[PDB]
Design an enzyme around this catalytic site. Structure first.
Site, PDB file in Angstrom:
ATOM      1  N   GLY D  10      34.801  26.474  65.185  1.00 40.56           N
ATOM      2  CA  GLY D  10      34.602  27.436  66.141  1.00 40.56           C
ATOM      3  C   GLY D  10      34.919  26.865  67.593  1.00 40.56           C
ATOM      4  O   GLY D  10      35.141  25.591  67.783  1.00 40.56           O
ATOM      5  N   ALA D  12      32.664  26.066  70.148  1.00 35.12           N
ATOM      6  CA  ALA D  12      31.861  24.967  70.649  1.00 35.12           C
ATOM      7  C   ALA D  12      32.010  23.837  69.870  1.00 35.12           C
ATOM      8  O   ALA D  12      32.323  22.533  70.415  1.00 35.12           O
ATOM      9  CB  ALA D  12      30.357  25.227  70.430  1.00 35.12           C
ATOM     10  N   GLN D  15      35.498  22.253  71.172  1.00 40.06           N
ATOM     11  CA  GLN D  15      35.498  21.533  72.396  1.00 40.06           C
ATOM     12  C   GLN D  15      34.575  20.277  72.751  1.00 40.06           C
ATOM     13  O   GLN D  15      34.903  19.218  73.204  1.00 40.06           O
ATOM     14  CB  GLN D  15      35.113  22.264  73.471  1.00 40.06           C
ATOM     15  CG  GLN D  15      36.061  23.595  73.881  1.00 40.06           C
ATOM     16  CD  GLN D  15      35.963  24.795  74.738  1.00 40.06           C
ATOM     17  OE1 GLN D  15      34.734  24.785  75.293  1.00 40.06           O
ATOM     18  NE2 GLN D  15      36.867  25.357  75.174  1.00 40.06           N
ATOM     19  N   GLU D  71      40.736  31.477  65.750  1.00 40.35           N
ATOM     20  CA  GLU D  71      41.536  32.123  66.696  1.00 40.35           C
ATOM     21  C   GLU D  71      42.145  30.748  67.432  1.00 40.35           C
ATOM     22  O   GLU D  71      41.589  29.822  67.468  1.00 40.35           O
ATOM     23  CB  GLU D  71      41.020  33.068  67.644  1.00 40.35           C
ATOM     24  CG  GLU D  71      39.929  32.458  68.464  1.00 40.35           C
ATOM     25  CD  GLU D  71      40.249  32.349  70.031  1.00 40.35           C
ATOM     26  OE1 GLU D  71      41.613  32.383  70.283  1.00 40.35           O
ATOM     27  OE2 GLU D  71      39.465  32.099  70.891  1.00 40.35           O
ATOM     28  N   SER D 140      28.593  25.888  66.786  1.00 38.35           N
ATOM     29  CA  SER D 140      27.469  26.718  67.253  1.00 38.35           C
ATOM     30  C   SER D 140      26.714  27.415  66.246  1.00 38.35           C
ATOM     31  O   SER D 140      27.372  28.059  65.430  1.00 38.35           O
ATOM     32  CB  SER D 140      28.091  27.391  68.640  1.00 38.35           C
ATOM     33  OG  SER D 140      28.664  28.691  68.062  1.00 38.35           O
ATOM     34  N   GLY D 144      30.580  33.719  65.981  1.00 41.92           N
ATOM     35  CA  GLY D 144      30.938  34.309  64.808  1.00 41.92           C
ATOM     36  C   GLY D 144      31.556  33.386  63.766  1.00 41.92           C
ATOM     37  O   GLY D 144      30.952  33.334  62.759  1.00 41.92           O
ATOM     38  N   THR D 145      32.394  32.539  64.273  1.00 41.42           N
ATOM     39  CA  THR D 145      33.193  31.508  63.501  1.00 41.42           C
ATOM     40  C   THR D 145      32.029  30.438  63.299  1.00 41.42           C
ATOM     41  O   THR D 145      31.651  30.281  62.280  1.00 41.42           O
ATOM     42  CB  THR D 145      34.352  30.889  64.257  1.00 41.42           C
ATOM     43  OG1 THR D 145      35.125  31.847  64.704  1.00 41.42           O
ATOM     44  CG2 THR D 145      35.150  29.796  63.206  1.00 41.42           C
ATOM     45  N   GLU D 254      21.065   6.776  55.696  1.00 38.43           N
ATOM     46  CA  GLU D 254      19.908   6.055  56.426  1.00 38.43           C
ATOM     47  C   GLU D 254      19.426   7.194  57.352  1.00 38.43           C
ATOM     48  O   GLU D 254      18.185   6.975  57.869  1.00 38.43           O
ATOM     49  CB  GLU D 254      20.289   4.637  56.946  1.00 38.43           C
ATOM     50  CG  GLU D 254      19.081   3.616  56.814  1.00 38.43           C
ATOM     51  CD  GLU D 254      19.555   2.517  57.262  1.00 38.43           C
ATOM     52  OE1 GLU D 254      20.610   1.986  57.661  1.00 38.43           O
ATOM     53  OE2 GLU D 254      18.877   1.381  56.781  1.00 38.43           O
TER      54      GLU D 254
HETATM   55  N1  LIG Z   1      27.749  23.330  74.873  1.00 38.95           N
HETATM   56  C1  LIG Z   1      28.293  24.200  74.609  1.00 38.95           C
HETATM   57  N2  LIG Z   1      28.291  25.463  74.081  1.00 38.95           N
HETATM   58  C2  LIG Z   1      29.457  26.252  73.838  1.00 38.95           C
HETATM   59  C3  LIG Z   1      30.733  25.807  74.160  1.00 38.95           C
HETATM   60  N3  LIG Z   1      31.578  26.736  73.919  1.00 38.95           N
HETATM   61  C4  LIG Z   1      30.821  27.866  73.176  1.00 38.95           C
HETATM   62  N4  LIG Z   1      29.392  27.473  73.447  1.00 38.95           N
HETATM   63  C5  LIG Z   1      28.234  28.157  72.961  1.00 38.95           C
HETATM   64  O1  LIG Z   1      28.526  28.896  71.602  1.00 38.95           O
HETATM   65  C6  LIG Z   1      27.980  30.157  71.452  1.00 38.95           C
HETATM   66  C7  LIG Z   1      29.054  31.077  70.905  1.00 38.95           C
HETATM   67  O2  LIG Z   1      29.595  30.234  69.949  1.00 38.95           O
HETATM   68  P1  LIG Z   1      31.518  30.074  70.062  1.00 38.95           P
HETATM   69  O3  LIG Z   1      31.613  28.563  69.547  1.00 38.95           O
HETATM   70  O4  LIG Z   1      31.739  30.335  71.257  1.00 38.95           O
HETATM   71  O5  LIG Z   1      31.890  31.107  68.901  1.00 38.95           O
HETATM   72  P2  LIG Z   1      32.931  30.946  67.970  1.00 38.95           P
HETATM   73  O6  LIG Z   1      32.791  29.940  66.759  1.00 38.95           O
HETATM   74  O7  LIG Z   1      34.172  30.368  68.635  1.00 38.95           O
HETATM   75  O8  LIG Z   1      33.041  32.441  67.184  1.00 38.95           O
HETATM   76  P3  LIG Z   1      33.947  33.427  67.549  1.00 38.95           P
HETATM   77  O9  LIG Z   1      34.929  33.174  68.657  1.00 38.95           O
HETATM   78  O10 LIG Z   1      32.976  34.809  67.730  1.00 38.95           O
HETATM   79  O11 LIG Z   1      34.925  33.848  66.306  1.00 38.95           O
HETATM   80  C8  LIG Z   1      27.490  30.380  72.873  1.00 38.95           C
HETATM   81  O12 LIG Z   1      26.196  30.322  72.725  1.00 38.95           O
HETATM   82  C9  LIG Z   1      27.990  29.539  73.655  1.00 38.95           C
HETATM   83  O13 LIG Z   1      26.670  29.097  74.741  1.00 38.95           O
HETATM   84  C10 LIG Z   1      30.959  24.507  74.576  1.00 38.95           C
HETATM   85  O14 LIG Z   1      31.986  23.945  74.919  1.00 38.95           O
HETATM   86  N5  LIG Z   1      29.866  23.729  74.823  1.00 38.95           N
HETATM   87 MG   LIG Z   2      36.261  31.843  69.082  1.00 36.21          MG
END
Ligand SMILES: Nc1nc2c(ncn2[C@@H]2O[C@H](COP(=O)(O)OP(=O)(O)OP(=O)(O)O)[C@@H](O)[C@H]2O)c(=O)[nH]1
Ligand SMILES: [Mg+2]
Ligand SMILES: COc1cc(-c2nccc3[nH]c(-c4cccc5c4ccn5C)nc23)cc(OC)c1OC
Ligand SMILES: Nc1ncnc2c1ncn2[C@@H]1O[C@H](COP(=O)(O)OP(=O)(O)CP(=O)(O)O)[C@@H](O)[C@H]1O
Ligand SMILES: Nc1nc2c(ncn2[C@@H]2O[C@H](COP(=O)(O)OP(=O)(O)O)[C@@H](O)[C@H]2O)c(=O)[nH]1
Ligand SMILES: [Ca+2]
Ligand SMILES: [Mg+2]
Lengths: 427, 54, 316, 437
Positions: D10, D12, D15, D71, D140, D144-145, D254
């Site tokens: 996903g 988060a 990145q 995506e 995250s 959703g992912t 560990e």
């Molecule tokens: N710390 C941090 N949190 C992130 C980042 N990107 C998204 N989030 C968090 O991720 C959560 C949502 O999850 P995402 O990763 O954006 O969703 P996804 O897995 O991409 O799922 P979908 O797009 O719904 O298919 C939210 O609470 C955001 O705050 C990031 O780059 N850093």
């Molecule tokens: Mg996404």
């Protein structure tokens, strides 16, 4: 992630034309369809509403639908008439005579498959189609009856895509015919079941805003439509410009609709702008935020203090401090926490977009899923019953095949809708 | 208090310090769960297409 | 406007305080479960401290100190005093106290004075260890009953002192200048709970501080400040400072203040002893308005301001 | 030498993995092209850094990493970024349309269409490992992912590699940086389905990273870049023992041994000091004692909670920079006097210390200043259950009304799964409450 736009009927096509005019000026596309703007931003998500044609021309993904040729000839003659793909003008000749039955069962049935062919040919050339956008009124016949027929067909063919409508609600202050409460009630039965989001643009509210707020003594439909086109650009800013959110129809639906049938949103705009009248003083962020939550800036004539917000989405446009925007938004929620349901935590989302709309340096658009919208439906229901208890004007419909039963069912479903909205107003 | 198991190396060291002493589903079942959700989704889709046919 | 939520409807004190806050016109009370509050007049049990201080754009205060229960439950209070070095094992101002669960430590010390003829009356007050110990089985704290309480006359009456102490978010320790004297109307025979005649010598079995000062002067040639109140300030301060590193909300995402009731007994030799500390105390009816306004002033309005004092700051 | 495979799921996850792999490349002296001159053993080796990178015949060092989003928008920036040459195309898997913030769309409907391809790319990584020890999964709770496809992937890994450890780096949802109203739903669901499949999980509350950024970095509006650079500092702290010489936390086993005595209670709190602004002109460098003491301030924790009102089951200190054991034990002996540190009666009140002499590495043009010494503490304290209580309460508020539920049922899920996950969470809170009082 492309969207297919569809405008149906007199009202449908006028507000649609104004929408395409407005966002085409936003994206730097001229009437010949060429890009003559100054930022790459203007093209970064141009694919959502435009196709690419030979010579790097941009053509709106817009299907124009009517049972009368008049209004669409007007569109062609209009300032951006030539930007639409000519093949995408689909018209009958007889008209719908402000009659839901004609739109949904007789005159519109003849035409609907042709419309669906043009839909299909726009979908096939779409890398990942998110869903559909309909503009129409509910008080006439074409937009109302044939628009809802089309929505039902489209759901049949594209069951896993998002159906999205901007639906002008009828009002006696701005009324063409006495049968509008019938056409609207039938229509609401359809919208409750085949659309994921419906923006409830109430002609009453547009009239009051034009009168009381903009100090227009005798407002035309053009003035009401200036307001509608402003709101529509605002609502769709996130699809059309890139932000931290990366915005789409489905996630908006998920975040706005706790219960499938309660998907009718009150839109609002701020600052309220009269057509042509230039605004010289930009607004402060506290000002945008107070106005944007003001009832006088709601496009649906409901008092938000008569209900509770289930979910809210707000979109700020312009160069401004996102810190101040958060401060002010948090501020409104914390100062009026009574009117936001407490069993949906963090039910207010805010986005920002750097590019402002034409004419303004600061603007804010508001999308509220409040239970107070029951008022609008109650209003239509009252008007409906006042005639229906005497079977008045029914012959216009029974002559087209409809039966009294279908009317009783439509009325009943809408009263149900009102009861649900009430149910969560006290939860 | 009591320092123990000190290990050193040219990148660092490590040790413990002590102060007080003390007083799964198979692939078959995964496919079964996923396919049950699949059937429920296809059934609701069929109910929709039936309502539309009416 | 400030926002606040009530979640203990029994609290007379915080009923008072919520009424005052409303009548300032700058505070509005919210539904009991609205998370968007500035201030929580919280429950006495299972208070959800893990939920405070996570509301963006909302400074949150609560009227209880998480952890303070270790001073305000008999068994844990005794434990704390014995085990903590600030309290120095047997300090001078706590009665000998023991935790026995419904035993070995009690016998060793008690039989020494049962043998030495020195009064062995611990406390449900008996002198035979078995009589009360086996009876408690039908957790309890076993404490030495001070058999030489202070004589109060006319009447030969035993008494206790309650002082009310407010600790604000900065960990200032405020002692309310008005303390209360809960008297026993019936004489003493060689329990003062107002819940247990009443009214003979003074109204409602409540003797105030001006009056008790004058009694101490006329009868004993001394001042309330010198004879008793200095020891009371010393105890209040030593107690609250022992637990400061465990309960202070200095660098926390939410803030605590709390009102405590300290219960003392004075013996015949004018020495001051700590009976118990109460985390949810009830003020005296005459004093309610003054003390509750003081809470608003120094605990609530110090954090949430608007647009001579009744407390003594116990300096640390 | 046993290899470790990183899986980023996903947005988060992807990145944050970006941020981590850039940091790792700066730390190991690996260039944006995959070349590490430091590496005289050309074409291969069994060095500590080889735990995270494999070698090619052309001297290129390649992350033992797979990125997976439903995506393409995010992984496509991975594909055109500074570190394009780093990853072999197969490692970057992308779907076509996302999970729309819906646990059940990511787990059930869209998930089953990509799970087998992910598993085969993961097996292409596993077949280049002489002794795989397990996986580090970045994701995250609220996506959703990140929520649904991650719990699916975790179940499958348990079946395909039932002898391999799996560690989680999990982002806990914070409204300041939120993306969906249903994130408590997704959080509870994925926690309940991933629990028994995950050996150790490092939770990161986006609230805590956010406030750390605003307070200690003087950044008014933290972007994802800020949050993720900081997060990657902590992640690197936690994984350096796997990429470097040492005796402490040398394999993934560990991590469970030292941090997790009970398998259910496997969420160690991370605390990290010092976080100092690169724009601070005059800065006074903090001592071993100052940064060790900062490790017991909540405002430095990855999750705001109060460890004084819990019990410890384990405690690690990972230092980086100018640190020597005498100074650590001196700081500890100071801190025990002044702070509330209570362990469970059946555990030793002790600290496992690990020191890496090379100071924390900072990405040029970042927000963090260089420091002479930093520490990352890993404590398994019951006070982290505060996060669970918060999540669960939010969940309860919505679920009492079945708000949004229909979105889940409509992807194939049953209301029962909601109640099941919630009961599991209630169990988990009870286990914490028992251990901790
Ligand atoms: N710390 C941090 N949190 C992130 C980042 N990107 C998204 N989030 C968090 O991720 C959560 C949502 O999850 P995402 O990763 O954006 O969703 P996804 O897995 O991409 O799922 P979908 O797009 O719904 O298919 C939210 O609470 C955001 O705050 C990031 O780059 N850093
Ligand atoms: Mg996404
Ligand atoms: C399609 O157009 C749009 C899409 C999005 C949008 N897109 C992706 C993810 C999102 N999450 C939330 C979102 C997150 C948390 C709470 C929320 C939302 C939305 C409403 N509440 C109460 N909104 C999201 C947002 C828009 O305006 C804010 C928008 O413009 C009308
Ligand atoms: N060692 C002792 N010597 C003399 N009297 C004592 C004593 N220990 C307790 N008492 C008496 O016991 C009475 C009640 O017991 P205790 O102090 O345990 O509860 P309390 O007075 O604070 C009222 P509550 O328990 O309802 O809050 C006190 O009023 C005090 O007079
Ligand atoms: N705001 C707005 N409302 C309109 C416009 N035209 C018609 N309406 C409303 O639409 C309803 C009549 O519908 P209309 O579009 O003319 O019917 P149709 O073309 O047969 O579908 C009435 O309630 C009108 O008040 C317009 O241009 N702007
Ligand atoms: Ca090598
Ligand atoms: Mg008309």
């Amino acid at each position: 992630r492309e969207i297919v736009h569809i405008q149906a009927g007199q009202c449908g096509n006028q507000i649609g034309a104004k929408f395409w005019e407005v966002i085409s000026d936003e994206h730097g596309i001229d009437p010949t369809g060429s890009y003559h703007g100054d930022s790459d931003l203007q093209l970064e998500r141009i694919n959502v509403y435009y196709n690419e044609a030979t010579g790097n021309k941009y053509v709106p993904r817009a299907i124009l639908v009517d049972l009368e040729p008049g209004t669409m000839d007007s569109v062609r003659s209009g300032p951006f008439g030539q930007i639409f793909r000519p093949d995408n003008f689909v018209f009958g000749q007889s008209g719908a005579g402000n009659n839901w039955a004609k739109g949904h069962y007789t005159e519109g049935a003849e035409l609907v498959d042709s419309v669906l062919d043009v839909v299909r040919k726009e979908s096939e050339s779409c890398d990942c189609l998110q869903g559909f956008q309909l503009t129409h009124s509910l008080g006439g016949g074409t937009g109302s009856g044939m628009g809802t027929l089309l929505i039902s067909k489209i759901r049949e063919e594209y069951p896993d895509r998002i159906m999205n409508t901007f639906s002008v609600m009828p009002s006696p202050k701005v009324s063409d015919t006495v049968v509008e409460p019938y056409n609207a009630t039938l229509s609401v039965h359809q919208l409750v079941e085949n659309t994921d989001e419906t923006y409830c643009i109430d002609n009453e509210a547009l009239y009051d805003i034009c009168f009381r707020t903009l100090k227009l003594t005798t407002p035309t439909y053009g003035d009401l439509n200036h307001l509608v086109s402003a709101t529509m650009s605002g609502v769709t800013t996130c699809l059309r410009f890139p932000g931290q959110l990366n915005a789409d129809l489905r996630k908006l639906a998920v975040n706005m609709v706790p219960f499938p049938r309660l998907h009718f949103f009150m839109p609002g705009f701020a600052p309220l702008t009269s057509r042509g009248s230039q605004q010289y003083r930009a607004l402060t962020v506290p000002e945008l935020t107070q106005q944007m939550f003001d009832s006088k800036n709601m496009m649906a004539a409901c008092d938000p203090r008569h209900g509770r917000y289930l979910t809210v989405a707000a979109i700020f446009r312009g160069r401004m401090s996102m810190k101040e925007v958060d401060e002010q938004m948090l501020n409104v929620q914390n100062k009026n926490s009574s009117y936001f349901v407490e069993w949906i935590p963090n039910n207010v989302k805010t986005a920002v977009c750097d590019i402002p709309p034409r004419g303004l340096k600061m603007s804010a658009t508001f999308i509220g899923n409040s239970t107070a919208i029951q008022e609008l439906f109650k209003r239509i229901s009252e008007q409906f019953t006042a005639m229906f208890r005497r079977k008045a004007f029914l012959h216009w419909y029974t002559g087209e095949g409809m039966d009294e039963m279908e009317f009783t069912e439509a009325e009943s479903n809408m009263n149900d809708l009102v009861s649900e909205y009430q149910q969560y107003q006290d939860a | 208090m009591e320092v123990i198991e000190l290990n050193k190396c040219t990148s660092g060291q490590s040790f413990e310090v002590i102060l007080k002493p003390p007083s799964d589903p198979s692939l078959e079942e995964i496919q079964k769960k996923l396919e049950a959700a699949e059937e429920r989704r296809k059934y609701q889709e069929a109910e929709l297409l039936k309502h539309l046919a009416e | 406007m400030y926002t606040f939520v009530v979640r203990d409807e029994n609290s007379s004190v915080y009923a008072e305080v919520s009424r005052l806050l409303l009548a300032t016109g700058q505070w509005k009370r919210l539904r009991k479960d609205n998370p968007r509050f500035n201030l929580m007049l919280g429950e006495r049990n299972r208070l959800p401290f893990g939920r405070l201080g996570h509301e963006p754009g909302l400074v949150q205060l609560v009227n209880y100190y998480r952890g303070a229960d270790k001073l305000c439950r008999k068994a844990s209070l005794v434990k704390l005093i014995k085990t903590s070095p600030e309290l120095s094992e047997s300090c001078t101002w706590f009665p000998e106290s023991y935790v026995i669960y419904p035993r070995e430590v009690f016998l060793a010390a008690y039989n020494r004075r049962r043998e030495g003829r020195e009064g062995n009356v611990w406390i449900l007050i008996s002198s035979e260890a078995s009589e009360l110990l086996d009876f408690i089985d039908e957790v309890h704290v076993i404490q030495k009953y001070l058999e030489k309480p202070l004589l109060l006359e006319p009447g030969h009456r035993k008494f206790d002192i309650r002082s009310w102490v407010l600790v604000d978010h900065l960990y200032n320790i405020y002692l309310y200048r008005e303390g209360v004297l809960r008297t026993s109307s019936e004489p003493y025979n060689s329990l003062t709970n107002h819940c247990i005649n009443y009214g003979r010598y003074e109204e409602g079995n409540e003797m105030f501080f001006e009056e008790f000062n004058q009694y101490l002067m006329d009868a004993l040639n001394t001042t309330l400040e010198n004879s008793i109140l200095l020891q009371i300030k010393h105890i209040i301060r030593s107690c609250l400072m022992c637990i400061e590193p465990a309960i202070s909300t200095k660098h926390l995402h939410y803030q605590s203040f709390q009102l405590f009731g300290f219960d003392f007994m004075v013996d015949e030799e004018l020495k001051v002893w700590l009976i118990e500390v109460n985390g949810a105390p009830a003020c005296a009816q005459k004093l309610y308005a003054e003390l509750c306004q003081g809470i608003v002033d120094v605990a609530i309005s110090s954090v949430f301001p608007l647009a001579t004092s009744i407390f003594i700051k116990l300096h640390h | 030498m046993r290899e470790c495979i990183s899986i980023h799921v996903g947005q988060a996850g992807v990145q944050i993995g970006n941020a981590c792999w850039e940091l790792y490349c700066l730390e190991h002296g690996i260039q944006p092209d995959g070349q590490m001159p430091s590496d005289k053993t050309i074409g291969g080796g069994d060095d500590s850094f080889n735990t995270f990178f494999s070698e090619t015949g052309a001297g290129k060092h390649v992350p033992r990493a797979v990125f997976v989003d439903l995506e393409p928008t995010v992984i496509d920036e991975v594909r055109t970024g500074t570190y394009r040459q780093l990853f072999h195309p197969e490692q970057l898997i992308t779907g076509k349309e996302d999970a729309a913030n819906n646990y059940a769309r990511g787990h059930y409907t869209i998930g089953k269409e990509i799970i087998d391809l992910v598993l085969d790319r993961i097996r292409k990584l596993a077949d280049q490992c002489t002794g795989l020890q397990g996986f580090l999964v970045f994701h995250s709770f609220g996506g959703g992912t990140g929520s649904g496809f991650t719990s699916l992937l975790m179940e499958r890994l348990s079946v395909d590699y039932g002898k391999k450890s799996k560690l989680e780096f999990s982002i806990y949802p914070a409204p300041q940086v939120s993306t969906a109203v249903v994130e408590p739903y997704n959080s509870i669901l994925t926690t309940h389905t991933t629990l028994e499949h995950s050996d150790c999980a490092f939770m990161v509350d986006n609230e805590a990273i956010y406030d750390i950024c605003r307070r200690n970095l003087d950044i008014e509006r933290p972007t994802y870049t800020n949050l993720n650079r900081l997060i990657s500092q902590i992640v690197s702290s936690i994984t350096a023992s796997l990429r470097f010489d040492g005796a402490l936390n040398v394999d993934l086993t560990e991590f469970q041994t030292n941090l997790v005595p009970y398998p259910r209670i496997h969420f160690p709190l991370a605390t990290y000091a010092p976080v100092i602004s690169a724009e601070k002109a005059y800065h006074e460098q903090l001592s071993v004692a100052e940064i060790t003491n900062a490790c017991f301030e909540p405002a430095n924790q990855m999750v705001k909670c109060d460890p004084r009102h819990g019990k410890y089951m384990a405690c690690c200190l990972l230092y980086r920079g100018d640190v020597v054991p005498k100074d650590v034990n001196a700081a500890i002996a100071t801190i025990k006097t002044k702070r509330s540190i209570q362990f469970v009666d059946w555990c030793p009140t002790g600290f496992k210390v690990g020191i890496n002499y090379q100071p924390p590495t900072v990405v040029p043009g970042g927000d963090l200043a260089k420091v002479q010494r930093a520490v990352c503490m890993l404590s398994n304290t019951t006070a982290i259950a505060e996060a669970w209580a918060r999540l669960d309460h939010k969940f309860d508020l919505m679920y009492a009304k079945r708000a949004f539920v229909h979105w889940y049922v409509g992807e194939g899920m049953e209301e029962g799964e909601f109640s099941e996950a919630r009961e599991d969470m209630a169990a988990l809170e009870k286990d914490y409450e028992e251990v901790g009082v």
